[model samples]
Target: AVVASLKPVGFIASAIADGVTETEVLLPDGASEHDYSLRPSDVKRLQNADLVVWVGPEMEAFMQKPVSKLPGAKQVTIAQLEDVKPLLMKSIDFNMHLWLSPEIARATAVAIHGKLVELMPQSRAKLDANLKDFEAQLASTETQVGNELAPLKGKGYFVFHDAYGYFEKQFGLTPLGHFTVNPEIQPGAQRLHEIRTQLVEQKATCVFAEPQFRPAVVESVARGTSVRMGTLDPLGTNIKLGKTSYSEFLSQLANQYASCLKG
Candidate 1:
């Protein structure tokens, strides 16, 4: 969605489709992957699939048990951080929603491209060519977007959750603070006060919230600050799956951020 939003025709749709043959990446929309309970049908898809691509065990703790039982199918966990420098998380075990970061997106694409080549050696040449083209397109788009957001670099912003660290770090923006609305519990007065103090100190321009997470904490904090409110989604939304490619995903996100920040 992001890539398509930027370079709609340059590198979208079929280009990404060509890389993955029969295997379909299934995203359970409108559900929080953190605590999502997979249905029997979802499990059947995993059991029958030639390959299953998902985030690391950290993000989807629920999958750890079922994935261990499924023996034959190849599962590719895209939590590249486990292989590289680990990202800072809310808890020691939490995965910090790494997909929101362009750095991880680029890295994961490289890893996925290699896996695609291995799976379909017949299309190795095509896959290689597509990977090169896709990466170049991403790099170019990142440079342009980064330049546009340069002024906001180091500028503070608050988030409803700590998921945006990767995105913030990649784009040179400062995560002044996060309003912790524990997915498993309710927020308390002390927690709200801590966020308010951080906002006051950082003079945060806006608070970003997620689609699935509650925004009341952010709204309450923004009440007297004159700070604006905006949102960004880690999961692909608005952008149609299958219809739009991964490149389009990044492009849409960049454009959305630009518009939101400008306001």
Candidate 2:
């Protein structure tokens, strides 16, 4: 089985490994990637994986040491892949949410294909077809998602965490900012003040809270403002892993953004 660190990445891996092998996600539903501490079972999972896939140490700091002990040939780090490195966005640190962009997802699928082929050379034909099918489906979905998001381009919003930059930029959406980089940490008083200022002045259309975070901060910040509260699941937690889950994730995100932005 191929073990991926997050559901969204697992979606991409599932698309390429559809019939070639089983794909598994490391992060559980509703867990924060920034804060999850691996359990003993998780360590064993990584140790036994036919292939391990993760963004990098920066995104899932918890996986740094565990993945380090594995052979280099056994893992594929999305953020470190040559084709994906140049596509990363900048922030308080490089935006480690690389799975948000369809282009990056395609690159990741390609890399996963290479690794899977190495492990099961007998499965090359199936893997090749899966990769081609994944790319085609992704292209069609990207265009559909872009069209769906285009109308919300100028609408401004704030997210509970700094996780949607790549998605926002890819689809031309406007995000005023975020409450925090790491959701487990409380936002600073000064930062909250700035966010409140934007809301009070009517500069934001909505404030988004993630499934993994408390809505208290977002609610408090947008209290009395005209801004709507919406939910954006950056991790695709509710989405089941499958060949088409990646496309579904993108469409779901577009729908979440449109629901509030167009309201």
| Candidate that scores best on lDDT | 2
Q: Which candidate comes out best when scored by TM-score?
A: 2
| Cα lDDT, model 1, residue 236 | 60
Task: Report lDDT (CA) for all predictions.
Answer: 0.59, 0.86
lDDT of 1 at 55: 64
**Over the stretch 1-263, how does candidate 2's per-residue lDDT look in tens digits?**
99999999999999999998899998889888887898888888988899999999889998999998899899889899999888988984698888898888988898899989988999999999999999888889989988998988788888877888888888899888876534545566777787788776757889888876566756666677788999899988778999999999999989988988995
Tell me how far candidate 2 lies from the true structure as C-alpha RMSD in angstroms: 2.2
What TM-score does prediction 1 earn?
A: 0.78
Write the residue-wise lDDT of candidate 1 on 1-263 in tens digits.
11111111112323543545543434445666566666667666666655555565777675777677655226546564344346444442555476665565556556656656676788788877776776777777678767767777656777776665665567676567666566444457787677777777787777777777566755666767777877776666555544235556666666656665664
Give the range of the ten consecutive residues with the poorest summed lDDT in model 2: 179-188
Instruction: For candidate 2, give the lDDT of residue 98.
Output: 89
Off-target runs (Cα >4 Å) in candidate 2 are: 181-193
